[PDB]
Amino acid sequence: YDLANYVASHVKDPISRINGVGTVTLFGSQYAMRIWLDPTKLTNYGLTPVDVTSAISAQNVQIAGGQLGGTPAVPGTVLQATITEATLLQTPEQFGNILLKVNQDGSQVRLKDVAQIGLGGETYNFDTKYNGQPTAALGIQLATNANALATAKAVRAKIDEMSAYFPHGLVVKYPYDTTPFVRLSIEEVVKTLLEGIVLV
Amino acid sequence: MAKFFIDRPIFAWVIAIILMLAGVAAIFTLPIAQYPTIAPPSIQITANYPGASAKTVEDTVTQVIEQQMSGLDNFLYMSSTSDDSGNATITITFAPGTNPDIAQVQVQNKLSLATPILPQVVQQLGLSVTKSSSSFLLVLAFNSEDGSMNKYDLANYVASHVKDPISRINGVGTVTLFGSQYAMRIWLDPTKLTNYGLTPVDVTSAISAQNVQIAGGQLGGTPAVPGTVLQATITEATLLQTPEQFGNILLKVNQDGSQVRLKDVAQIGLGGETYNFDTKYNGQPTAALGIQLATNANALATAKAVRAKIDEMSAYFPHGLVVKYPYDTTPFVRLSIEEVVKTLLEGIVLVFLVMYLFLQNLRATIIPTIAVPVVLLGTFAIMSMVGFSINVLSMFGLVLAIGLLVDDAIVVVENVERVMAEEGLPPKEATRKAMGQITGALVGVALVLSAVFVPVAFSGGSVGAIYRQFSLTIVSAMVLSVLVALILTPALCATILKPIPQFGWFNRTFNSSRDKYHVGVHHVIKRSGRWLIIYLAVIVAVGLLFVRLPKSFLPDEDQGLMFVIVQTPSGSTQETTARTLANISDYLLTQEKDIVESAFTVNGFSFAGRGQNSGLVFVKLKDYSQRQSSDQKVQALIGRMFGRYAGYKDALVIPFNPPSIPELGTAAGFDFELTDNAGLGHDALMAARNQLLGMAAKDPTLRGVRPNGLNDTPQYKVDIDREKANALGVTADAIDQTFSIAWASKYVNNFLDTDGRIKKVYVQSDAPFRMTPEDMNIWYVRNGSGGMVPFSAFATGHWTYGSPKLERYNGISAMEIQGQAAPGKSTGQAMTAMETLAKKLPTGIGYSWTGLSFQEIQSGSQAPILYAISILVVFLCLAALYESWSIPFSVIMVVPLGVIGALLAATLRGLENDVFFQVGLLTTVGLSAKNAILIVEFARELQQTENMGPIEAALEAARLRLRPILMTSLAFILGVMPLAISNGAGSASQHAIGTGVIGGMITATFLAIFMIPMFFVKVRAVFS
Amino acid sequence: LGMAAKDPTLRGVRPNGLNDTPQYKVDIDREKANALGVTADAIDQTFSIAWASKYVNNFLDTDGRIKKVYVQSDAPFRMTPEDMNIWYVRNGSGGMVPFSAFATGHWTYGSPKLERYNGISAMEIQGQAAPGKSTGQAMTAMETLAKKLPTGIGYSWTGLSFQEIQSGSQAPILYAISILVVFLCLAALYESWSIPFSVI
Amino acid sequence: ASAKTVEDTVTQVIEQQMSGLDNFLYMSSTSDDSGNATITITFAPGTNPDIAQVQVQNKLSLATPILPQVVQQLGLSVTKSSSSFLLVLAFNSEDGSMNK
Amino acid sequence: GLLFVRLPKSFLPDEDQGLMFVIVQTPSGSTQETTARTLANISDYLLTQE
Amino acid sequence: ASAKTVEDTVTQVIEQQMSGLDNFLYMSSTSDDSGNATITITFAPGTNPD
Ligand SMILES: CCCCCCCCCCCO[C@@H]1O[C@H](CO)[C@@H](O[C@H]2O[C@H](CO)[C@@H](O)[C@H](O)[C@H]2O)[C@H](O)[C@H]1O
Ligand SMILES: CCCCCCCCCCCO[C@@H]1O[C@H](CO)[C@@H](O[C@H]2O[C@H](CO)[C@@H](O)[C@H](O)[C@H]2O)[C@H](O)[C@H]1O
């Protein structure tokens, strides 16, 4: 999940913007805030999953606050500043404290009490290995009528640029790449051309 | 070719006629614009999130759109901001050459795919995709002189009556209304809400429910029962239209039967969609309308047409309404066109007078005066075919090009006259003999000069965009001129000129002079080594003058405008900043009453974004003819404004003359993007910004290094104790929505105004209840069991810091730093200094180059490579001409001659090494190469047909070429002289070109006539 | 149109638009409805679903093709104004109140479609040249009749008519340019100003 | 929307944004009591219709923040039009086994 | 000169393509049943008398 | 969602609108239990991808 997240958060979007890159596939994703419900615990508090989805949507929010002294203000107002009310939650701990119920004895039920919260994948569809070790994979598909050698060289350059900010231990390999083949075959026919010149 | 058309003047005149006709057609169909497009296409998306903070916009709007912006062909980079006016702006920049239509549609389609993810309010308000431009044809100010209309009335009027007719004027491109218009404003009163137990969401929902347009189907609709004999569309429910109807919306009914209505709980009425800004004309309310020119229309007719339609429909403006034109560039382009036509006609008269002076033969003078107009008209015809426009850059191209095409005309006719007189032959044989001595050299001249000019045409970037219209107009004219010298003018000479049968002081003085010159040519030859040391002295002077002469793109003209940036201290309001702007307008209209025509003020805007603490003043000056003197020019007004407002505590006031082409910025400038590459956060990035800026302000390689955006500013946080509220039975949604509607306002739905137009509906608290943090406690929200709870029950607030403007580059948070290279230092070395500073920043902070520094990085080793190609092909063309690997050196060495003169003239007049200087220098170096090419050509032909030695050949060829060289230089210096001594609009550019070329022609021709034969004999001695 | 009916030059002149049609407005007395316990939304939605129909969602037909689901009143109940009485809406207490209790009918007349040509309100007319007349002669007759219309009513030609005007008015200029070009071509070919003239 | 509502709030707005179109010849538009707006932009003969379409769409972006929210959300459709009613197929059930 | 100016002008001739249109427009407010009946009138004439 | 849900609620909905395309060559769609609808439309060679 960490490798898929790093790639999603630092490599994929800029690579997706290189000319000639038609499309980009991450077998993985950026982190997703993951809320794993427990039905027996939901039953205990008289709650359903919809209660949970609704509370996330009401308590995980960014709210327009307008302004102190904002416009149109009463004549004479001489101070203004933006108001911040509610913000997106950020860590699984904050989500675990979302409020679900006020039960009879005065306690309030919270999402931590009905679910496991953590960062994981948007999808659990994939599993990738490079030489049997964990990997995060980016499939680069060439845009229609774009030049494979040009695009591959540009993306390899952008990756070389981004390598300056890799976390410790992060390595990049190129498991599948057809442009070395095309480049080497053009190179080889050039070599035969010059051999034939000498022979003539 | 030449000998072909000599024997047949009819065919040559048919070709001349076709060129002339096509040229006239191009005169009347070519586009007119002040400048060609320069900068690469950029597409910007804008979004509005009413009441959202910069952080809210970055997280709910900007980041979503950016994450969706991919698969765009030819993307160079992307740059976005998110600010406290609730505004998102994302600009995508594409590579030079990209089709702007395709970039825009590609951007719009990715944006359409992105739209569902965005906040519902952002979606409902609509996003904009537009091509980023910095230029306008006209900007109209619709003003209420008697106060009958405020800015909302004015903008409403424009949108209802002007924008549509104006859009249908031929040649009008984009039409922008700077101005907000009517909206139904519901101003909630919290106490009246609490008394009836209502919340702002009740109001929004009632509006959503009662201001509706309902499809009624139709009577007798299909499928119908048999026998029905009438259809009719049925209308049920229509949008509310008037404040009374909105106030009569039913909100609640009490048990006693009484009804609670919106009028009982809020103030309802027409207001503006936004109050973020205010615009004033000369202290009057105003609404502005920007008219941008359609692609490939002519600016002059479009502007005349717009002013004519505005005049036409001003017959029906309500009382008190007037239209002013605070912005208009078109007088100045009309003036450039008049000035160029004046120069071209003068150039024709000058060739007439010079041919007569040296030849005193009317018949021979008329040939160049036919040939030059034909080539100019053909140049217009070629410009039409190639897609150029009539613009200041191309017009200066024609101005510089007469020096080449009159030189061709004089070479042809003067050489025919010399052969016809000194050798005594009749016209057909004389022209055949004279055009057999120059045809190959003329072909070679065309190729060599084209080579001279290709490093300019093939230059990349916006600077190359400046160059190429200019240089390629020169190249078109030159190539046609060579064709005309080989097609029309030999036939004109062979048919027009007659034999010569049987002032005088001037003839005697020129003959004495050319004898002293001939002896001087010999002197320099015999003293070669001394004058080769002198040649190296000239080269060293070229270097030192070049390094000392300031860099520049275009000279800054007084175009009758001045822009004033106004930045008041943080937290300032619209009311407070309005008074710095009001001060400035009153000052301009009273103290500068005789200099200033308009002062247009907008607060709410800098050039770099919005803010209540920021404004602009747009001031137009009086007609250039009523503005004589040095005190009355814009530069002096900028000085007086620095004086008045540098000692001004309330605001930062920057007066400045707008640059001609703003996209170029400053030649010494650099544009840097400091980026958060490790997800380290805003605080870390600004810590790095401040660290880097502190280093740069100590750096002698750098000057003026400033952070392009804003420092963090204090903000007020509302903390809701959600569990305390829930214990009270109050749900988080009720709290946040009540607070947000009251403070940030809310867009509910559309309504149909009494004029039949669709407008927006907003509910927000009335201003008295949302001004202060205390007001946050006067607001109520209901709990799950009914009844009202105050915000004071569960809400506290506290002050903090946050950015009011959040910048992103290529999708990751950034902060743009902008500066200049230190005087005497280059931009590349400035970039290296910045980079070594950036290396010394904490790990995870990266950076990118943007703008003209990015352009410089992309094309780095292009300039030297193009020069090598140019030099090589010049050399190869000359080897073919001379059949020698060494003789071309006697021509190529002419280059620094004349360059020294241009540098000398510019430095002694304080002008700068700008683009005008550079193109002028290229044409004069081209002419010196041509003069050297013909000197060496005749020296060669004499050395091989009359078996002469190198010195005899050099001396005789110098005698032969002295007259035509002097004829051309005299005509050309006199032709550009009026530009080099100019009063009035555009004189800075006219000076920038004229000073340089006069200096160049002077030293070029004198040093060339004395040193080129010495070089010829020297190369002949050295490699033979 | 009345003028064209008598102009012997032309036949079949008809408007390409639509005459004003009778229209029926339904006025809801929202105060009565609020007093009787129905919200404006309920009456709005019932009358639209009943008369205008509603596309609710898709269904999957027996052939495997996705198609639409529509809800509307059966024809006998939505045919005449007199029908609008039978529709009931249930109020906030669960009781039913009929439309006749709070709504009124109103006849009027109005346009079924508005035309704009280059932004100017307009009405399109098409016609034929009478047997024995050309398209151009019919257009001259049309301009003669339009000349006799009230001041402020102008006209334009579009489509075939516009292209016809281009053809007819450009031909003489093209003949002139063609004569000039033949003149210059023979002047060049035969090195004479007298040969091309004697030919022209 | 009524015919007048459509014309004044949809059709006119869309037309206003159509300044600056390369090779514009004229434009004609309809606004019906069915709520329908149809604006047909005709260009010079020989104009590239694909370029014309991309330009019309790029100009249409300007209209969306002015258009009624519902119209802007529901979507505007842009197409290369024709009246070349080329051929019409009539499908008939001769044995009567199928109706309209 | 006079023979050119006198000559009636046109764009293209009306060729018989083997096809013809008949446009029918009934009073405003009329129903699908009413227009179906006029279209049938035209179809009956064309398919019996013509 | 299942491949069948994907086909009924997305793939058939999009396909029913893929008409009026210049240089249409063929179309190939797939709906799978990973919730993915992929509709590839191929045009004649030389069709402008833009
Ligand atoms: C209604 C009032 C009368 C009409 C107003 C006239 C409007 C059109 C005139 C030119 C507008 O062109 C606009 O000018 C300003 C100053 O050159 C440029 O601004 C430039 O310099 C300023 C400060 O030097 C920086 O804030 C900014 O990074 C840079 O873009 C801006 O990039 C260009 O977009
Ligand atoms: C006579 C017939 C000649 C053919 C027609 C062309 C006319 C003028 C010739 C100019 C050759 O074109 C010129 O090529 C050079 C070398 O690639 C380019 O330079 C580019 O490539 C080199 C490496 O490939 C880089 O080092 C350099 O930073 C980059 O800008 C330059 O931007 C372009 O302008």
Ligand SMILES: CCCCCCCCCCCO[C@@H]1O[C@H](CO)[C@@H](O[C@H]2O[C@H](CO)[C@@H](O)[C@H](O)[C@H]2O)[C@H](O)[C@H]1O
């Ligand atoms: C391959 C290259 C190397 C070989 C160089 C050969 C020439 C060098 C001769 C001396 C140079 O300096 C000077 O040359 C010129 C040549 O006109 C002569 O003087 C004179 O000669 C001719 C007479 O025909 C006069 O017309 C001319 O005004 C005058 O210069 C003289 O002989 C010598 O005083």
